């Protein structure tokens, strides 16, 4: 059905005058978002991908400005039709994840783009991890935010590594405010990632001593806190392996 639908659509510039009316009435924008959402649902086939394939400048115009549907339509279009470094380089929700810490259209746009910005699983990277480190503790929906937090942990498992050290430092600086459960799971995720990446580690010595002192003071304080303290032993293992809100 996708094949025959796209072909007879091709039987019967557009963006040159179609981004005219963002000022001007909520109809033609959702119209072209509907058309591009339909065309975003069709994965021999290289010849029809060539038919679908210059749209990117219009996408990045849409991705960085009523709003919260058309961006998701273009996100799905790009993720189907159209590498990690160049795909992450075009930060496409940098001002959106910036606006993810300003919490009612926003109150549904946040959960709307929780599951939409999972697709970023697949300097600027430092700023993106910085904005994500504010967005993740900026909601402490529940399950969709936890899925986005697991996505951020897996994004931190990708890449240089001083950004990962700064992110683990940001987790160790935020966990000291609780030493809620979302920050505890995020610091547990950074502890597990540092335990996996401690071989590159073995400045950082005194911060690691402060983190281990905070973990020892939390462990000397005698359930999500039980799971966080059980993961904190992996942070002690990360300290003994690498070296041995705002």
């Amino acid at each position: 059905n996708a094949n025959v639908v796209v072909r007879l659509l091709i039987r019967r510039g557009l963006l040159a005058a179609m981004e005219e009316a963002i000022k001007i009435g909520n109809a033609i924008m959702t119209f072209y978002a509907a058309l591009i959402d339909l065309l975003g649902r069709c994965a021999e086939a290289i010849r029809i991908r060539s038919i679908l394939r210059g749209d990117l400048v219009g996408v990045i115009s849409i991705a960085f400005q009523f709003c919260p549907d058309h961006k998701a339509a273009m996100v799905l279009f790009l993720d189907r039709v159209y590498v990690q470094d160049f795909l992450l380089h075009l930060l496409g929700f940098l001002p959106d994840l910036r606006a993810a810490a300003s919490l009612t259209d926003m109150a549904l746009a946040l959960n709307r783009y929780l599951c939409t910005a999972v697709l970023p699983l697949l300097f600027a990277g430092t700023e993106h991890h910085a904005s994500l480190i504010d967005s993740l503790l900026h909601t402490v929906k529940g399950c969709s935010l936890t899925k986005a937090q697991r996505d951020s942990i897996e994004v931190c498992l990708l890449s240089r590594p001083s950004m990962m050290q700064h992110l683990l430092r940001r987790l160790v600086f935020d966990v000291p405010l609780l030493n809620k459960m979302p920050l505890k799971l995020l610091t547990n995720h950074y502890e597990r990632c540092w335990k996996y990446y401690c071989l590159p580690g073995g400045a950082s010595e005194e911060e690691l001593h402060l983190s281990r002192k905070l973990f020892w003071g939390i462990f000397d304080a005698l359930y999500e806190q039980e799971l966080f303290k059980l993961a904190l032993p992996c942070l002690s293992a990360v300290a003994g392996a690498l070296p041995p809100n705002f």
């Binding site: 072909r7 091709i10 039987r11 510039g13 010849r47 060539s50």
Partner: protein
């Protein structure tokens, strides 16, 4: 009656810009040109259109399954694959080889035009590597259906395989849009051709004198005079003359007596313009009218138009005792007196009106066209450098 393998044909639209008979055939220059263009057949009387670089020859007629055979091998086509001559059906996938260059018509991968979003342009290429050379034909008729034979003079739709697009006349490009465009067929010359040693139109040849016809050399005049010269001028590339016929359709038919033909030298382009005032002269491409340039071929000194086929080669190349006569004035080609034996068009002349013919060959033409294209390109280059 039908269409088979190796049928030299053309394509022909009828553009109705301002209700005119703005007619055209499709051209492919090549040997320096990777884009295609048109050739006006409307005002063929005053300024006659070029025709040797607008014909095409169907090298192969296949189904879709043979195209997936081309998908199977990572060519050789099993040397036909099939027959034979394989009379063409609708819905087949044909291959258009350009008749002069030997290149194959393909759908390009660029859009060097409007813009006009993502269509493609039309040009030649080298080989049949991939789907970009093959052309499905869909019937442009509610009269006829698909899978059945294609007759002489049918109106159809050309659709490529790779791009899966039309063969569309733009406003003035020819490109691969998403709108239909009729493309008719005129059978030029097929087939075969027919026995060896025959006057058949579209051939380039000479005229023996004992000695041949010639044109003076370059760096001049602008080569607008006619001499004779003996010697090795047959080996020379400036003694080259092409029998250009009058009809568009069936232009590559056989040659009888009687019927007249336009004439044109292969490395100049300035037509053999018998200016009817005095005698033999030479003028440009726009001069060549109906009565002004075409010469009638008479079997003697004494003195049809409608044949829907190849027909009878009256004249071979050996016993070609030919008697060139103009249309209107009735003059005849005789001489006067590095031999400066200048030929004239006279009523009576000598007994040396009876000259014998001699054909040319393939590669001589296949370089002689390159000569004129190269020379005019470098003279445009000289203009740009003097600018």
């Amino acid at each position: 009656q039908f269409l088979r393998t190796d049928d030299e044909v053309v394509l022909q639209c009828t553009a109705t810009i301002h209700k005119e008979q703005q007619k055209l055939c499709l051209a492919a220059e090549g040997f320096g040109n990777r884009l295609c263009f048109l050739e006006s057949t409307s005002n063929s009387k005053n300024v006659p259109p070029d025709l040797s670089i607008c014909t095409f020859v169907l090298e192969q007629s296949l189904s879709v399954r043979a195209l997936q055979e081309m998908l199977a091998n990572t060519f050789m086509m099993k040397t036909a694959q099939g027959g034979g001559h394989r009379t063409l059906l609708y819905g087949h996938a044909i291959l258009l080889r350009h008749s002069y260059s030997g290149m194959y018509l393909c759908c390009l991968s660029t859009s060097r035009s409007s813009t006009d979003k993502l269509a493609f342009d039309v040009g030649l290429q080298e080989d049949t590597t991939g789907e970009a050379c093959w052309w499905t034909i869909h019937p442009a008729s509610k009269q006829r259906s698909e899978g059945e034979k294609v007759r002489v003079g049918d109106d159809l739709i050309l659709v490529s395989v790779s791009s899966e697009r039309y063969l569309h006349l733009s406003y003035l490009h020819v490109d691969a849009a998403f709108q239909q465009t009729l493309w008719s067929v005129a059978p030029i010359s097929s087939g075969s051709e027919a026995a060896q040693g025959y006057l058949i139109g579209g051939d380039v040849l000479r005229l023996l004198h004992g000695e041949c016809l010639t044109v003076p050399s370059g760096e001049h005049e602008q080569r607008r005079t006619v001499h004779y010269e003996g010697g090795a001028v047959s080996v020379h590339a400036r003694s080259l003359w092409r029998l250009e016929t009058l009809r568009v359709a069936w232009s590559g038919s056989h040659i009888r007596w009687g019927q007249p033909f336009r004439l044109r030298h292969v490395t100049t382009g300035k037509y053999l313009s018998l200016m009817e005032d005095k005698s033999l002269l030479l003028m440009d491409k726009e001069k060549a009218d109906v009565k002004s340039t075409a010469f009638t071929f008479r079997s003697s000194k004494e003195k049809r138009k409608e044949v829907d086929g190849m027909g009878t080669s009256e004249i071979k190349y050996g016993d070609s005792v030919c008697f060139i006569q103009h249309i209107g004035t009735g003059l005849w080609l005789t001489y006067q007196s590095s031999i400066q034996r200048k030929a004239i068009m006279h009523h009576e002349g000598h007994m040396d009106d009876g000259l014998n013919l001699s054909r040319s060959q393939h590669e001589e033409s296949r370089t002689a066209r390159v000569i004129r294209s190269t020379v005019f390109l470098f003279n445009r280059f000289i203009r740009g450098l003097d600018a």
